[PDB]
């Protein structure tokens, strides 16, 4: 009937958890105590980009380190110029309930999708001075919650129908599909080598995916609530998560463990975005109480605050070279910090 | 801004700003509505009367030179607790119920109780619709009763403020207003003077639903502004 399944369940549970607990010799705090911290840091607003009507949900830095893109509920994609505070392109959507956007590493395409079960592709470089749609992806059941680029031809999308899917832009059909999540998944973080990527869902569990074989590898658990922001360590061996219970955690791939947890008593709202710095020392995580925060990754301590947004923070980006940090919010202004 | 190229750059970035101004001017003069309901409820016919695995649908209706945009969510997952955050700026919610079934109404009551009390759905007034009333009449003149599933119907009396328009049968009106009050009890226990409930009695073909929506929206915006300007 059903007695066979649970027996194997606790069998595997006790087979894995004992080894996982035994591998944990000591916490990172003991080692990191000796390192001199960095102390107190000032960050100041250096620009303020204005022009969006409604709230803002996404942004993505370019490889050029000078261009960036953002999407809004009024149905707009706008491509800025971070140096001279200019606008380059203004793209109108078809479905106004957009939730994510991406900028191609080669700087040739952008993709967006949301509460229409479709991810679109816009071609920035053509012979006619326009930006047009070129490949519109249908096949998902739920809303799109994340999307990332591998190259000019392979794109990874995350959807509300509990399945991740690797696509092929040239033909428009999937080449792989990932299953294993009970609840709808919210975000995915690529690897620096573009051969693996982690995933997060509303199930308080994070998994590891391998593109080439299309099969899962590991499962990470420990959060008390759902996960709505994940970011991958620059080294290529760790990642950090963001939950709705005022908690951010650090995880290790090879060790299969849970590292320091970044929480404070005076915080009640839920994290919305997480990002690192070029050297991995700083973690920048915006919060629903109108304020971003910055932490010391090694010591798990607050070092200064970046206030100045009137409403919720929804997106957060750090340049490739570490020059500047851009923050977006529901009050429709992006503030650059340097 | 010294070389001619940067001058052409700022000229382009100004043209874009003018286009955004026009878009904002159009965006300011339009009201967005969210339509909710179940499968058995005739919300599939309300949209047709007013008028591919897609995820959302849009329909447009104009009354007295005011534009209303109502978004009906199509093929989505059952859980809505995650995609409901995108809708905390609309004017009102048009809830729909089929009051003929008498047994699959506890689910509707729980759904209303969940929608009304959502933390992101505060400050949003809800317009309640009670659909397919002729079926209730055609099911109640033969007697399948409501006492089978709602024992407390036996101690219910028609309130003095009731104004039965048809007058076909006192029991029809008693049961109708019983269901109305049963739905209305949910909103009264909370809401603390920030949002309301506007019940109605609708059937399949009712070419007055647009006017009801218009009047309810007008009476929501007026209350909001009066609250803002320290007059309520």
């Amino acid at each position, epitope marked *: 009937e059903l007695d066979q399944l649970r027996q194997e369940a606790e069998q595997l549970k006790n087979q894995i958890r004992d080894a996982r607990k035994a591998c944990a010799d000591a916490t990172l705090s003991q080692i990191t105590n000796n390192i001199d911290p960095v102390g107190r840091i000032q960050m100041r607003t250096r620009r303020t980009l204005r022009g969006h009507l409604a709230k803002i949900y996404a942004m993505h830095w370019g490889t*050029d380190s*000078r*261009l960036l893109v953002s999407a809004s509920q009024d149905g707009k994609l706008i491509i800025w*110029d971070s140096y001279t505070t*200019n606008k*380059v*392109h203004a793209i109108p959507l078809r479905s106004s309930w957009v939730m994510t956007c991406a900028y191609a590493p080669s700087g040739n395409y952008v993709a967006c999708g949301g509460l229409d079960n479709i991810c679109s592709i816009y071609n920035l470089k053509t*012979r*006619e*001075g*326009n930006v047009r749609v070129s490949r519109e992806l249908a096949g998902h059941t739920g809303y799109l919650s994340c999307c990332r680029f591998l190259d000019d031809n392979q794109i990874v999308t995350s959807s509300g129908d509990t399945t991740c899917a690797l696509w092929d832009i040239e033909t428009g059909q999937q080449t792989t599909t990932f299953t294993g999540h009970t609840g709808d998944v919210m975000s995915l973080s690529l690897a620096p080598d573009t051969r693996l990527f982690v995933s997060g869902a509303c199930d308080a569990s994070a998994k590891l995916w391998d593109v080439r074989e299309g099969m899962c590898r590991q499962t990470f658990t420990g959060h008390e609530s759902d996960i709505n922001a994940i970011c991958f360590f620059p080294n290529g061996n760790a990642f950090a998560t963001g939950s709705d219970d005022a908690t951010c955690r650090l995880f290790d791939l090879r060790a299969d463990q849970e590292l320091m947890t970044y929480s404070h008593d005076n915080i009640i709202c839920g994290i919305t975005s997480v990002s690192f710095s070029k050297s991995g020392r700083l973690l920048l995580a915006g919060y629903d109480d109108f304020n971003c925060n910055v932490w010391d990754a090694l010591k798990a301590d607050r070092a200064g605050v970046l206030a100045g947004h009137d409403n919720r923070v929804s997106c957060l980006g750090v340049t490739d070279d570490g020059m500047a940090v851009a923050t977006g919010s529901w009050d429709s202004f992006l503030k650059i910090w340097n | 801004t*010294l*070389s*001619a*190229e*940067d*001058k*052409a*750059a700022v*000229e*382009r970035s100004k*043209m874009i700003e003018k286009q955004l101004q026009k878009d904002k001017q159009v965006y300011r003069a339009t009201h967005r509505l969210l339509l909710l309901g179940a499968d058995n409820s005739g919300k599939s016919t309300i949209v047709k009367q007013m008028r591919k695995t897609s995820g959302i649908f849009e329909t447009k209706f104009q009354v007295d030179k005011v534009n209303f945009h109502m978004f009906d969510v199509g093929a989505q997952r059952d859980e809505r607790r995650k995609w409901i955050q995108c809708f905390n700026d609309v004017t009102a919610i048009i809830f729909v119920v089929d009051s003929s079934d008498y047994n699959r109404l506890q689910e509707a009551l729980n759904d209303f109780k969940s929608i009304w009390n959502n933390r992101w759905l505060r400050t949003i007034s809800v317009i309640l619709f009670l659909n397919k009333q002729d079926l209730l009449a055609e099911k109640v003149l033969a007697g399948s009763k409501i006492e089978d599933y709602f024992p407390e119907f036996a101690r219910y009396t028609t309130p003095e403020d009731a104004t039965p328009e048809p007058g076909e049968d006192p029991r029809v009106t008693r049961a109708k207003y019983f269901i109305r009050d049963e739905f209305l009890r949910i909103s009264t226990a909370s809401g603390d003077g920030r949002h309301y409930c506007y019940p109605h009695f609708t059937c399949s073909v009712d070419t007055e639903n647009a006017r009801r929506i218009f009047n309810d929206c007008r009476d929501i915006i007026q209350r909001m502004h009066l609250r803002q300007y320290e007059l309520l």
Partner: single-chain antibody, 233 residues
Framework: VQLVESGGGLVQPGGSRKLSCSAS????????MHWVRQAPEKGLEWVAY????????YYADTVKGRFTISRDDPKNTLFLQMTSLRSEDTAMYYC??????????????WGQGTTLTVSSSSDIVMTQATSSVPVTPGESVSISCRSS???????????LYWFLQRPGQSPQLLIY???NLASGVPDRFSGSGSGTAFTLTISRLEAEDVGVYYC?????????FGAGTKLEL
């Protein structure tokens, strides 16, 4: 993308005639419409410049009180006006495009041009090194161009272009802003510079490369041109 203009010919001195350029196959409303003029036997030179939204209209020092350019954004047609033609009004008129934003490549597509014949300061001056060089199909070629003043700007950008008109063909674009390659020209071409003297270096060579090569500056409003360096087999 195809641009076509018609009209022109032989007129008596002092007349005024209207030239129209018709554009099809692209979003004309978002492009500038420079008028670069080529003398019947000499190098290129400017005539006018209207921006995309008709905001700014520069004119040429030689002709400013007689030449007016107008565009018809709906019908998508470009116009030129002249007054009291002199003997100099014999040169060649071409329809050029351009587009300015971060990372753009101005001066992309050129028209076929129209022919008109007439019966009987502090400008940055640039001069090219030579006028004719014999070459071998497979060797390495180099051309040099000189500018009176430094072209590099405070924002770290050098405004130099190499066109290389081919015989019997309208001009083209190879290298834009010193060290950047144009839209799918053969990769053998390249460019290098220092700030005042610049070199165009072709690695291999083919029968197509024959023609005349030009130099152009874009640091400040007036757009001066080089003389030309013909290559013969």
């Amino acid at each position: 993308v195809q641009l076509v203009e018609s009209g022109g010919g032989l007129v008596q001195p002092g007349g005024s005639r209207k030239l129209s350029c018709s554009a099809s196959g692209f979003a004309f409303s978002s492009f500038g419409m420079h008028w670069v003029r080529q003398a019947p036997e000499k190098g290129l030179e400017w005539v006018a410049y209207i921006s995309s939204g008709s905001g700014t209209i520069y004119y040429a020092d030689t002709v400013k009180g007689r030449f007016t350019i107008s565009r018809d954004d709906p019908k998508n047609t470009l116009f030129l006006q002249m007054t009291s033609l002199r003997s100099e009004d014999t040169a060649m008129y071409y329809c050029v495009r351009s587009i300015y934003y971060y990372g753009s490549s101005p001066f992309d597509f050129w028209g076929q041009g129209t022919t008109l014949t007439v019966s009987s300061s502090s400008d940055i001056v640039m001069t090219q090194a030579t006028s004719s060089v014999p070459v071998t199909p497979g060797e390495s070629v180099s051309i040099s161009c000189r500018s009176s003043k430094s072209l590099l700007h405070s924002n770290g950008n050098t405004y130099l272009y190499w066109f290389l008109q081919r015989p019997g063909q309208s001009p083209q674009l190879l290298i834009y802003r010193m060290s950047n390659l144009a839209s799918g020209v053969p990769d053998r071409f390249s460019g290098s510079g220092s700030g005042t003297a610049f070199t165009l270096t072709i690695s291999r060579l083919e029968a197509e490369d024959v023609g005349v090569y030009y130099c152009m500056q874009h640091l400040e409003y007036p757009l001066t041109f080089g003389a030309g360096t013909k290559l013969e087999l």
